[PDB]
UniProtKB/Swiss-Prot annotation:
Family: Belongs to the extended synaptotagmin family.
Assembly: Homodimer. Interacts with ESYT1 and ESYT3. Interacts with FGFR1 that has been activated by FGF1 binding. Interacts with the AP-2 complex; identified in a complex with the AP-2 complex and FGFR1.
Domain C2 as annotated: residue spans: 9-131
Tissue expression as described in the entry: Widely expressed with high level in cerebellum.
Name of this protein: Extended synaptotagmin-2
Entire protein: shown range: 785 to 913 of 921
Lineage, uppermost ranks: Eukaryota, Metazoa, Chordata, Craniata, Vertebrata
Protein species of origin: Homo sapiens (Human)
Stretch list, region Required for phosphatidylinositol 4,5-bisphosphate-dependent location at the cell membrane: 56-63
Superkingdom as given in the UniProt entry: Eukaryota
The protein's role, per its UniProt record: Tethers the endoplasmic reticulum to the cell membrane and promotes the formation of appositions between the endoplasmic reticulum and the cell membrane. Binds glycerophospholipids in a barrel-like domain and may play a role in cellular lipid transport. Plays a role in FGF signaling via its role in the rapid internalization of FGFR1 that has been activated by FGF1 binding; this occurs most likely via the AP-2 complex. Promotes the localization of SACM1L at endoplasmic reticulum-plasma membrane contact sites (EPCS).
Subcellular location(s) of the protein: Cell membrane; Endoplasmic reticulum membrane
Entry note about domains: Anchored to the endoplasmic reticulum membrane by a transmembrane hairpin structure; both N-terminus and C-terminus are cytoplasmic. The C2 domains mediate lipid and calcium binding. The N-terminal C2 domain binds calcium ions and is important for calcium-dependent lipid binding and interaction with membranes. Two calcium ions are bound at a high-affinity site and a third calcium ion is bound with lower affinity. May bind up to four calcium ions. In contrast, the second C2 domain apparently does not bind calcium. The third C2 domain mediates interaction with membranes enriched in phosphatidylinositol 4,5-bisphosphate and is required for location at the cell membrane.
Amino acid sequence: GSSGSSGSPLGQIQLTIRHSSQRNKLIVVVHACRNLIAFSEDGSDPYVRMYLLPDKRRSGRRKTHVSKKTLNPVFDQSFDFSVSLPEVQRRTLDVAVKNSGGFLSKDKGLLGKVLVALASEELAKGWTQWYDLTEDSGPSSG
């Protein structure tokens, strides 16, 4: 280990995950994000991306609105996906918050991303917490 940054400079995000066994669906609410560094003070366009791993098909892509001229975007929206617990369990919810600044850049510019394990049993009830975004460097157990 090496001494470096102290805290979560990339940013964080709060998502309420709750999978009902009766409805066999996966509900995910995107309250809002904070501490989202901008590639340029001028203004960045932060946005949350939700993907049901492993499947990454570019068809079921479910994301929230893209706020402009702001670092702390707010959507407070709620999504849903018809998936049985048996599956969602061995699956993962790829949640990455990048900036849609495709203007004179030619890159996605990853600001921050965090993975969540839906292999929990306390999903029916649901929980709320701030997932501290981290760098790409990480295991992809899809």
